[PDB]
Design an enzyme around this catalytic site. Structure first.
Site, PDB file in Angstrom:
ATOM      1  N   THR A 168     131.835 -58.560  49.038  1.00 32.64           N
ATOM      2  CA  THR A 168     130.944 -59.699  49.171  1.00 32.64           C
ATOM      3  C   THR A 168     129.565 -59.475  48.574  1.00 32.64           C
ATOM      4  O   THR A 168     128.827 -60.448  48.394  1.00 32.64           O
ATOM      5  CB  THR A 168     130.783 -60.076  50.649  1.00 32.64           C
ATOM      6  OG1 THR A 168     130.041 -61.298  50.754  1.00 32.64           O
ATOM      7  CG2 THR A 168     130.055 -58.973  51.393  1.00 32.64           C
ATOM      8  N   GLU A 226     135.577 -33.620  73.211  1.00 26.94           N
ATOM      9  CA  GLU A 226     136.832 -33.052  72.738  1.00 26.94           C
ATOM     10  C   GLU A 226     137.268 -33.616  71.394  1.00 26.94           C
ATOM     11  O   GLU A 226     138.004 -32.937  70.666  1.00 26.94           O
ATOM     12  CB  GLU A 226     137.943 -33.266  73.768  1.00 26.94           C
ATOM     13  CG  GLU A 226     137.732 -32.488  75.055  1.00 26.94           C
ATOM     14  CD  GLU A 226     138.828 -32.716  76.074  1.00 26.94           C
ATOM     15  OE1 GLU A 226     139.695 -33.577  75.832  1.00 26.94           O
ATOM     16  OE2 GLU A 226     138.825 -32.029  77.117  1.00 26.94           O
TER      17      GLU A 226
END
Ligand SMILES: Nc1nc2c(ncn2[C@@H]2O[C@H](COP(=O)(O)OP(=O)(O)OP(=O)(O)O)[C@@H](O)[C@H]2O)c(=O)[nH]1
Ligand SMILES: Nc1nc2c(ncn2[C@@H]2O[C@H](COP(=O)(O)OP(=O)(O)O)[C@@H](O)[C@H]2O)c(=O)[nH]1
Ligand SMILES: Nc1nc2c(ncn2[C@@H]2O[C@H](COP(=O)(O)OP(=O)(O)O)[C@@H](O)[C@H]2O)c(=O)[nH]1
Lengths: 431, 50, 617, 430, 431
Positions: D171, D246
């Site tokens: 765009t 984690e």
């Protein structure tokens, strides 16, 4: 909250500005009295971009009208929306410029330009934040072109960072109205190249062609041409005034359109332009709007894009539409017409989406194309200017107003250099 | 009117309904059941007469 | 038997939709345009009204005869007919079928002898008709595509050889001198002179030669008729003009309305300075101005559907009626309260009305980008409406006339990239949850305490119109465009049913007994269904002349109403069918309706904006 | 205890934040007014004495329209008025404008409010920065804000869910420019950056949801579902709990390589739902399908380095083990020779809630597969030539220079992206 | 979803097309304003075959009107269903062809053919899938035959694989309207043989005979003949538009009908055509429909099939009917009239069944016969053409519009070769 200061210059500029303000007031639900009667929140949500609030509910346009003859703004005041404008913003002389750019830029424009800048500064200082100024006027007219270029130079000096948008009516290719059109156009383009940040070229013959071929009107007056110009002028800034799924301001359009600072002239077009006979029989679809938008007949400039190459092109769509549909349509257009698009820019499309379509239309789309096609428009204007200047016809009228002959040569050289830049980026090759 | 267009109250005529019905087996089955019932009634009447 | 109690309708788009009947000693003091027909009613409400219906499509022009006759004009359908109505007869008098396209404007002579009718498209004709027999002059041609906005007649210059008709078409004024003795028309275009304004209304002076044209620019342009040129212009009423009336007595005065509701008195004399000062302000945009009650009231209309009476001796303002504007889509009744009726519309407006006196109890307003109120449900203190954007907005019900406050909203209830706008909202019995039907066929059960979604139920592939909840934690839909309807279960598991017909449905209602379900199809067939039966119990063919669009049901299960495009609402026994009572009063196809919680009362709405109240006894 | 501060920069950031916060409110039962009729909202909301819950979010934009749409829309009583921060002038698709001239005061105020928000958090798992690579606001202001956050907060995990330019469709015009600039900026600041492509998500909507006309609302709804599946283990307990900390431990082999491909499964409308079993193995296979990938980057070209799977709903470790074994045994899926396991499976007992008005159906199982793979170098390869093609002619360079940048900045960004390419090639090669 | 592009040519073609579109709009329940008032799902199920959706509920026919004089199109537009057609689909010239095939094919047909192909391409590209084109026009007229053959050739060039169906009004045996009918017919048949995939021969005298004998209409207007033609044109494609028990599209009909590429001319007839007096007396059964269908008087071509031999014959039945009943009727017809059927094709019948009968009719059946009887009609046309061409009467007009005389000889040779092929397969013996 990003304000725009509108200025109208000359007879053509004043008429175009009056029509444009009529259209904008209709879009925001503002009657010629300034009161809001639209029954919609979004209409008043961003009304401060163009209007200021009076003591009551009255909304005064942030418009400044210029002329050297009072008849044009008398007509403007007596028109349908003449009463919205504050009377203090009508700046008038007493003797009009005799289609003389020299009169409108040096002799008679000098006295009135002080009042014009005073009104402009008063309007700008009241603004919270200013996106910039838009000036509507005609190239090839004395007071219009002269005062417009002078005012654009002054505002460029005062507010360098603020945006400058210009809607200039370039003299038409085939049928010329006044004789001194090439002189005025050549002098004004030199100023617009240096000062105007963003400029739009409009040709009355292109407007006549589009209104007779697409709209299929029989007797199109100047009101219809002004209406199309007003539609484009509204559609370029509708993203500021209304919420957008992918909104884009004037500065965003300029950044994504202008590759190099001097190449800021654009041809514009509005879709969908449908004849009254085929209004029902057409279908408002994104592919249909794109197809009509990329047609050369839709362009409001005389130059057809087929001859040139699209450097850049912004498309501001309006309505409840699919961003996927818009992006796919414009990518497909670019792939299909890769010959007409510049190679060293991978994406030549700046697509914007606004949530609010214009009144009456479910969907709309305004187009702003920067292409090397405008090179032929400048070439034709120079082809007339050189023919006149070789024999120095009508040169004494400009010489007696106190501007040197060398100014004509300088303007012609600048305009030819712009033509050369357009040709260079037309035939530039990647790597 | 169009000569091909049948007039009202004709064996050819069908309303907008009973057109677009698109159901042949059901109509034949219903007609078969009606004919069977009518035939049984006729046999009953003949039995009574005899 | 259906008895019409009151009709609330007004074509607010038209300039001059409502108009008084001067020196009307008998009934029917006012006449309003609402759609196909004309509502000829008394000045005071709660009074019987007549319905002048002889047209087929919307009415484009309305004209009074200064006491003695009304006139309405058609639109499209190749039958844009100019129909003359008589006050006493209340029946059509003349039917001029000479305009191929909608009649743009119509007006009556100041002496009630001549009749001007102007079309615009493919035949632009200023027909002048005599009160006796027919036309006098064929036309003057005009030009196709030139929208004839308004017209007026000169009170003076009635020598039998001249009749000055002023016609405003777009930004063009034309004076038409008509010789009816010779039947000639001469049209002189008024020299504007930089004066380009759109004229909403036209009115000559008492002595003529001065034509006042009110414009959208809040200005009255005074034009010299003798010279056929614009003489002067004065601002009158900020907002616009709308309706312009000659002063009841006046010296040179002229009453002016405004789109701001202001009413002022503009006089040509008095210098260039005005300093506007209205003597009366009405709520809304003024489009009609007249005088009635023996010339004691000003009877000012509104673009918002309002009619108001302004006293002349003391400037006292008394509302008369209000009309919901737009295509009205749903009618709702409070669960137990028969005094309040909620009517929604495609315009973002919902009117809660007191059925005792048809006054505006409260109003709910939303912006146009919020879709249209395509379904409604009323509560003792709430109005829950499902809109065209798929959102379900619940507004705090108010009293006395005020904009309601939006208490809450379920956002994106039915908007799935293939169909937006929830239709056929329903509330649980006693009130436990909210059943909603999407435009694509998804049924959704919503909690009321926490507004959380409790069931999404997607089997129907097309528009849901006519959903209804049973008496115990179960519900059923209608599913237009896919000619089937299924009874469901809140445990997100369809319970059999799914009865398919042969034509697409338009509405479905459930009787008091939990086994009777009525459906209406575009084939103009009313189908009765037993929940225990696999086939519909029976079907009534050709219930209406045109397609049926809505079906209702009394809370006792005795009768159910049916409204269709024939503008006629009928009542049918639930089990025996037949016509308990039928009547045609809406000036449009009937879109929705609702029975009262008690025995008496039926409220129906039309596509034009007409709300009709009915007594069932 | 497990609070996560959400930042939404630019129009795209705010428009995905709308979907994200709608989803969070629906999941926690929070009404749009602000309050619900526990402590699982603490990750995204902070409760007041009155019982009203405010999200720990910050909507940053230099354009007023997008934020005012929120201020006027449905969630006007939910969000904090000062948390919605709006500028006066848009960045106009200029990275220089959004990073050097306009963005200074806006980002300083953003740090002020972010510090205030972090003051309300006992713990702080990290930041969720949602911006748009390819726009001046998102790129410039987002880069500046990320730099300030890295400077002051330090080791807090900042997860940037960036939206990158699509290969062919786009765009903007200066999108390659500000994309390269933003990538150079965020290569050294964000801890885990998740790549998103509008073209890929459009294809997902067209093929899986059967939407022939997908829009930004649908794209943002899908992104919100992905982020909710990512954060589900913070708010709802389940077997094999996986944490924000984690993620980067089990997914980032080397600090430079922290860009993530994201794939959600299943993507089915209500009509096509409940027609197939949608077993754990089938949805895992669908998640590992290249077409379901939310980036226009075929994983077959590269090699997987790590894959973290976030399962939601009725998922059993036996089934997830069988599915992952089948995936490993599959020949088409190729892991690097130096990563034997390459899998981080985590299950959650809370099925993903369905947004009313969304096209996703109610599924009892869901998989969010976030993978580190060397294939992602392909998108950088595309931007690296889309950039230099313009940069040869120095097109639009004056715009960026006017707001306080230099040609040296462009050269440095291009060289840094080339270094990123060579690092990807080096890690991919044995 | 298999679209068909309709084209009308000349006065006769335009009138027939207007009547056909009226019939189809009635059958699909479309009012003259285009809105759907049809009250059935199946009507809108396949409306896209002939129509496109407008902005609202309006449906625009996929029809293209072509003419050289504007009078016929003005009359069609003023007619009852003149407003459904898109105004852009009316392509007309300014000077009509004076019954001159040369004027309609070379001089004046050349300029308008560009616009005609432009409209055709715009209509065809909008189609998702295109079954093909159907062109309704009249042999023996200037503009009709001229641009009919020209446009058919152009569309054959552009879309070779797409179907071409033609409804040509061949000049009638006994009564001739214009003098140059044999010339125009000879020039047009040569083009149709090469270009048209499927060609349908209609004769005004055969239509008069059928409507005077079966319908017992005593003074039949051209509207009646056009409406019979319209019924046939609808029934030939109703299998595309409606669900069928055994459906058969245009390509299936062409494959089952055309044994060899040059033998693609057919005579058609419609059932049940009943006079108003005997409408209550006639009972509609499939055997009754077949009995009326195989009657020679029922054929809309003047040639009677008794003289020739049926190469192939397709019958599209419409209504709730027994496939066993239909198949038994057709097999019994073949067995009874085996002398009239070609021996080296074991089954000369292609039976199709659609479940939706036309409005007003319980059952209907449209017949399409490929038989060698067309030989005698082409023979008569050649008998007139040779008689005129021996003395070269009226030849100078065609010569002065710019075709060599050798074109007449080549066209006559081609028509004679077609006649020879028809005779060959008439008297061909098996083994
Ligand atoms: N995935 C997704 N991307 C979006 C969405 N909206 C916008 N974008 C992308 O975001 C890019 C620009 O975002 P922004 O920088 O925020 O645009 P802006 O708010 O006008 O700010 P500037 O463009 O920098 O002036 C565009 O190139 C789009 O591709 C969306 O809703 N979803
Ligand atoms: N589109 C449009 N063009 C106009 C209008 N009025 C004048 N022009 C054109 O503008 C050109 C210059 O005239 P103008 O600048 O207005 O004269 P000036 O005001 O004395 O300088 C002429 O060639 C006209 O063709 C108008 O109302 N609309
Ligand atoms: N069936 C039928 N035949 C027609 C009609 N109009 C003309 N014809 C016949 O068609 C033949 C050819 O005329 P036509 O092609 O329309 O003339 P052109 O348009 O000038 O080429 C004439 O001999 C007419 O007898 C009609 O409306 N219906």
């Amino acid at each position: 909250m990003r304000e725009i200061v509108h200025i109208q210059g000359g007879q053509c500029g004043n008429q175009i500005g009056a029509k444009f303000w009529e259209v904008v007031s209709d879009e925001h639900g503002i009657d010629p009295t300034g009161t809001y009667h639209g029954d919609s929140d979004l209409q008043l949500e961003r009304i401060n971009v163009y209007f200021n609030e009076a003591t009551g509910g009255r909304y005064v346009p942030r418009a400044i009208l210029m002329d050297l003859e009072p008849g044009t703004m008398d007509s403007v005041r007596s028109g349908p929306y003449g009463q919205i404008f504050r009377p203090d913003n009508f700046v008038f002389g007493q003797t009009g410029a005799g289609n003389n750019w020299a009169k409108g830029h040096y002799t008679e424009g000098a006295e009135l330009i002080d009042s014009v800048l005073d009104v402009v500064r008063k309007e700008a200082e009241s603004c919270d934040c200013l996106q910039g100024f838009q000036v509507c006027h005609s190239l090839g007219g004395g007071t219009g072109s002269g005062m417009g270029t002078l005012l654009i130079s002054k505002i460029r000096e005062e507010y360098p960072d603020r945006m400058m948008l210009t809607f200039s009516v370039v003299p038409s290719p085939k049928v010329s109205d006044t004789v001194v059109e090439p002189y005025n156009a050549t002098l004004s383009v030199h100023q617009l190249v240096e000062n105007a940040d963003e400029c739009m070229v409009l040709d009355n013959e292109a407007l006549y062609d589009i209104c007779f071929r697409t709209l299929k009107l029989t007797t199109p007056t100047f009101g219809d041409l002004n209406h199309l110009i007003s539609a484009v002028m509204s559609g370029i800034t509708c993203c500021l005034r209304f919420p957008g799924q992918l909104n884009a301001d004037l500065r965003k359009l300029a950044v994504n359109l202008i590759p190099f600072p001097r190449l800021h002239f654009f041809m514009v077009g509005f879709t969908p332009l449908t004849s009254r006979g085929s209004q029902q029989y057409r279908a408002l679809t994104v592919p249909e709007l794109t197809q009509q938008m990329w047609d050369a007949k839709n362009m409001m400039c005389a130059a057809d894009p087929r001859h040139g190459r699209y450097l850049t092109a912004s498309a501001l769509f309006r309505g409840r539409m699919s961003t996927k549909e818009v992006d796919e349509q414009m990518l497909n257009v670019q792939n299909k017409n890769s010959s007409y698009f510049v190679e060293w820019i991978p994406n030549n499309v700046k697509s914007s989406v606004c949530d609010i379509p214009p009144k009456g239309l479910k969907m709309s789309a305004t187009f702003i194309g920067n292409s090397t096609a405008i090179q032929e428009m400048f070439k034709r204007v120079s082809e007339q200017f050189t023919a006149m200047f070789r024999r120095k016809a009508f040169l004494h009228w400009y010489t007696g107003e106190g501007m040197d002959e060398m100014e004509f040569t300088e303007a012609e050289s600048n305009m030819n250099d712009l033509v050369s830049e357009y040709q260079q980026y037309q035939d530039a090759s990647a790597e | 009117g169009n000569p091909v267009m049948p007039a009202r109250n004709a064996p050819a005529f069908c309303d907008e309904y009973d057109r677009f019905n698109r159901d042949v087996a059901g109509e034949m089955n219903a007609k078969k059941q009606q004919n069977l019932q009518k035939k049984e009634e006729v046999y009953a009447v003949k039995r009574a007469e005899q | 038997p259906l008895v019409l109690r009151h009709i609330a309708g007004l074509n607010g788009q038209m300039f001059g939709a409502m108009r008084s009947i001067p020196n009307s000693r008998g009934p029917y003091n006012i006449a309003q345009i609402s759609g196909v027909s004309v509502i000829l009613g008394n000045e005071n409400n709660l009074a019987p009204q007549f319905t002048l219906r002889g047209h087929d499509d919307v009415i484009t022009a309305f004209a009074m005869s200064h006491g003695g006759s009304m006139l309405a004009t058609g639109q499209k359908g190749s039958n844009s007919d100019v129909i003359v109505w008589d006050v006493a007869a209340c029946a059509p008098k003349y039917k001029f079928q000479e305009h191929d396209v909608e009649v743009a404007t119509v007006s009556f002579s100041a002496d009630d002898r001549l009749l001007l009718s102007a079309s615009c498209f493919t035949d632009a004709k200023l027909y002048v008709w005599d009160m006796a027999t027919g036309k006098i002059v064929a036309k003057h041609g005009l030009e196709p595509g030139k929208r004839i906005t308004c017209s007026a007649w000169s009170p003076a210059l009635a020598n039998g050889r001249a009749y000055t008709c002023a016609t405003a078409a777009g930004e063009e004024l034309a004076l038409w001198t008509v010789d009816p003795f010779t039947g000639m028309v001469s049209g002189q275009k008024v020299v504007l002179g930089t004066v380009r304004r759109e004229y909403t209304s036209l009115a000559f002076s008492a002595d003529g030669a001065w034509l006042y044209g009110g414009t959208t620019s809040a200005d009255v342009v005074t034009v010299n008729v003798q010279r056929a040129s614009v003489q002067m212009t004065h601002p009158v009423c900020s907002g616009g003009v709308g309706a312009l009336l000659l002063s009841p007595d006046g010296g040179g005065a002229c009453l002016v309305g405004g789109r701001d509701g202001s009413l002022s008195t503009f006089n040509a004399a008095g210098g260039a300075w005005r300093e506007l000062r209205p003597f009366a302000k009405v709520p809304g945009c003024v489009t009609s101005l007249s005088l009635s009650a023996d010339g004691g009231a000003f009877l000012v209309g509104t673009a918002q559907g309002g009619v108001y009476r302004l006293d002349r001796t003391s400037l006292q303002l008394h509302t008369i009626s209000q009309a919901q504007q737009g295509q009205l889509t749903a009618v709702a009744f409070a669960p137990g309260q028969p005094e309040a009726v909620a009517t929604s519309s495609t315009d973002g407006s919902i009117y809660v009305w007191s059925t005792a006196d048809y006054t505006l109890q409260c109003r709910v307003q939303e912006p146009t980008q919020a879709g249209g109120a395509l379904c409604c449900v009323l509560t003792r203190d709430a109005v829950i409406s499902g809109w065209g954007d798929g959102n379900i907005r619940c507004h705090a019900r108010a009293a006395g006339g005020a904009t309601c406050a939006q208490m809450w909203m379920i956002p994106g209830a039915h908007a799935l990239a293939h169909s937006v706008g929830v239709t056929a909202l329903r509330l649980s019995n006693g009130g436990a949850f909210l059943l909603s039907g999407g435009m694509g066929g998804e049924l959704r059960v919503w909690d009321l305490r926490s507004r959380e979604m409790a069931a999404h139920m997607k089997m129907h592939n097309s528009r849901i119109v006519g959903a209804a909840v049973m008496a115990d934690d179960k519900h059923v839909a209608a599913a237009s465009e896919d000619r089937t309807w299924s009874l469901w279960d809140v445990g997100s598991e369809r319970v059999r049913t799914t009865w398919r017909g042969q034509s697409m449905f338009r509405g479905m209602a459930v009787s008091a007994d939990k086994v009777s379900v009525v459906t209406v199809t575009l084939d103009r067939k009313i189908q009765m269904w037993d929940v225990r039966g696999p086939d519909p119990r029976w079907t009534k063919v050709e219930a209406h002349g045109k397609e049926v669009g809505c079906v209702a049901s009394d809370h006792r299960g005795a009768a159910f109403a049916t409204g269709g495009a024939d503008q006629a609402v009928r009542v049918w026994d639930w089990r025996n069918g037949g016509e308990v009572g039928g009547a045609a009063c809406h000036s449009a196809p009937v879109a929705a309706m609702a029975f009262s919680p008690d025995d008496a009362g039926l409220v129906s709405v039309a596509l034009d904006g007409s709300t009709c109240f009915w007594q069932l006894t | 205890m497990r609070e996560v501060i959400s930042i939404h920069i630019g129009q795209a950031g705010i428009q995905v934040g709308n979907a994200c916060w709608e989803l969070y409110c629906l999941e926690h039962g929070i009404q749009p007014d602000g309050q619900m009729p526990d402590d699982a909202f603490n990750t995204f909301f902070s409760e007041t004495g009155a019982g009203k819950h405010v999200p720990r979010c910050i909507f940053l934009d230099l354009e007023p329209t997008v934020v005012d749409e929120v201020r006027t829309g449905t969630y006007r009583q939910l969000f904090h008025p000062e948390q919605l921060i709006s500028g006066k002038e848009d960045a106009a698709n200029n990275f220089a404008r959004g990073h050097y001239t306009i963005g200074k005061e806006i980002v300083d105020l953003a740090l002020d409010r972010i510090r205030k928000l972090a003051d309300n958090c006992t713990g702080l798992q990290g930041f969720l920065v949602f911006n748009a690579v390819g726009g001046g606001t998102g790129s410039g202001l987002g880069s500046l804000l990320l730099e300030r956050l890295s400077v002051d907060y330090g080791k807090k995990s900042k997860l940037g869910f960036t939206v990158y330019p699509s290969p062919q469709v786009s765009t903007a015009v200066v999108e390659p420019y500000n994309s390269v600039l933003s990538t150079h900026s965020l290569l050294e600041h964000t801890d885990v950056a998740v790549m998103l492509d509008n073209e890929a998500i459009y294809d997902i909507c067209r093929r899986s949801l059967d939407i022939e006309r997908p829009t930004y609302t649908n794209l943002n709804r899908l992104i919100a579902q992905v982020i909710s599946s990512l954060t589900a283990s913070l708010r709802f307990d389940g077997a094999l709990n996986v944490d924000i900390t984690e993620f980067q431990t089990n997914l980032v082999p080397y600090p430079r390589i922290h860009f993530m491909l994201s794939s959600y499964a299943p993507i089915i409308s209500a009509e096509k739902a409940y027609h197939e079993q949608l077993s754990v193995a089938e949805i895992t296979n669908a998640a590992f399908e290249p077409a379901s990938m939310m980036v226009k980057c075929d994983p077959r070209h590269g090699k997987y380095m790590a894959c973290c799977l976030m399962y939601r709903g009725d998922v059993v470790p036996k089934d997830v083990n069988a599915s992952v074994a089948t995936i490993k045994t599959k020949r088409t899926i190729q892991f690097v020779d130096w990563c034997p396991t390459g899998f981080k499976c985590g299950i959650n007992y809370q099925p993903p809630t369905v947004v009313p008005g969304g096209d996703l159906a109610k599924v009892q199982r869901a998989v969010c597969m976030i993978s580190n793979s060397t294939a992602i170098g392909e998108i950088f390869s595309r931007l690296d030539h889309k950039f230099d093609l313009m940069y040869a002619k120095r097109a639009f360079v004056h715009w960026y220079v006017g707001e306080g940048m230099e040609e040296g900045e462009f050269s440095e960004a291009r060289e840094d992206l080339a270094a990123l390419e060579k690092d990807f090639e080096e890690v991919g090669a044995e």
